Amino acid sequence: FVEDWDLVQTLGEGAYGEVQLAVNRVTEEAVAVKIVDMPENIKKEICILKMLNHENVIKFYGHRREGNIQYLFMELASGGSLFDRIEPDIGMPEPDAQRFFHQLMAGVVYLHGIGITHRDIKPHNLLLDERDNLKIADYSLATVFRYNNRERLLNKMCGTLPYVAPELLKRREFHAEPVDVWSCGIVLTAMLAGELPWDQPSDSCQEYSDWKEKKTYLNPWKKIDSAPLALLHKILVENPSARITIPDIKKDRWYNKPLKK
Ligand SMILES: Cc1c(Nc2nc(N)c3c(C#N)c(N4CCC[C@H]4C)n(C)c3n2)cnn1[C@H]1CCOC1
Ligand SMILES: [Cl-]
Numbered sequence: 001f002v003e004d005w006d007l008v009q010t011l012g013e014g015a016y017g018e019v020q021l022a023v024n025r026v027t028e029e030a031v032a033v034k035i036v037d038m039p040e041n042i043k044k045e046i047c048i049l050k051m052l053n054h055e056n057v058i059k060f061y062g063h064r065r066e067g068n069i070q071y072l073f074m075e076l077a078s079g080g081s082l083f084d085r086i087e088p089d090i091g092m093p094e095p096d097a098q099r100f101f102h103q104l105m106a107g108v109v110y111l112h113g114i115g116i117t118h119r120d121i122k123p124h125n126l127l128l129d130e131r132d133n134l135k136i137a138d139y140s141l142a143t144v145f146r147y148n149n150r151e152r153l154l155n156k157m158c159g160t161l162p163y164v165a166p167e168l169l170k171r172r173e174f175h176a177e178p179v180d181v182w183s184c185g186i187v188l189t190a191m192l193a194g195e196l197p198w199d200q201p202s203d204s205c206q207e208y209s210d211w212k213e214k215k216t217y218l219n220p221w222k223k224i225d226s227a228p229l230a231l232l233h234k235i236l237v238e239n240p241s242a243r244i245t246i247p248d249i250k251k252d253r254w255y256n257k258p259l260k261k
């Protein structure tokens with residue numbers, strides 16, 4: 001009801017909808033509410049949200065529908081978004097980046113383990129609690145890629161062009177997991193350089209060709225230390241069948257380097 005909740009401010013807009021800081025008119029509890037203005041899509045999103053139980057995935061509370069409006073209730077992330085911790089053209093301190101990347105991989109390992117692909121991993125969708133623990137949010141593009149132990153290939157184009165893997169632009173069908181791995185490597189680049197390497201990973205994009213030709217003396221690569229750059233060389237591999245998998249990311253030298261807060 002317009003009587004149970006006060007909409008105090010917009011937190012942003014997701015793939016399919018928009019998000020308000022709602023305050024309870026009775027208890028003053030502050031939550032995030034996603035306000036859906038119109039379906040088969042939200043039925044699917046609510047179903048996936050009900051599956052989620054992990055420290056690095058957003059807490060779902062429940063949902064209400066009123067006419068052509070539906071309301072999804074989630075834990076308000078008191079630390080805001082990772083996007084807001086990235087200093088343009090700088091990034092953030094390498095130890096903070098490494099901890100966030102550890103937590104990102106734990107959330108993604110959890111999702112992939114229950115056969116869910118997120119499909120829109122980017123800093124706008126990665127939230128922080130009051131202890132700066134990272135939470136993977138926005139399940140509006142999420143879908144099942146594994147059921148009864150059988151993999152299904154993806155065939156729909158979606159996500160955010162600077163974060164999408166190249167196969168998603170080129171192939172009629174592709175594996176879900178390597179796409180999410182790619183977008184995590186663009187997130188790591190953003191965290192360490194405070195800039196995105198390209199508009200899209202297409203041959204008609206010069207910044208993408210430059211990377212394929214290994215010109216890491218150019219930005220954003222020249223801002224990144226050799227160890228995390230070496231991980232980014234294994235993640236941002238054009239052929240998804242040669243791209244590093246999460247088990248191997250967990251064996252990376254930089255991933256395992258002790259770093260000082
Ligand atoms: C408390 C707070 C948040 N907290 C928050 N908590 C959520 N739970 C979501 C959320 C979801 N779910 C979401 N969005 C936007 C569209 C995609 C989705 C991830 N956004 C953006 C969410 N932001 C964001 N800033 N601040 C502070 C700092 C500046 O302002 C107040
Ligand atoms: Cl910016």
Ligand SMILES: [Cl-]
Binds near residue numbers: 086088190194195196
């Ligand atoms: Cl950025």
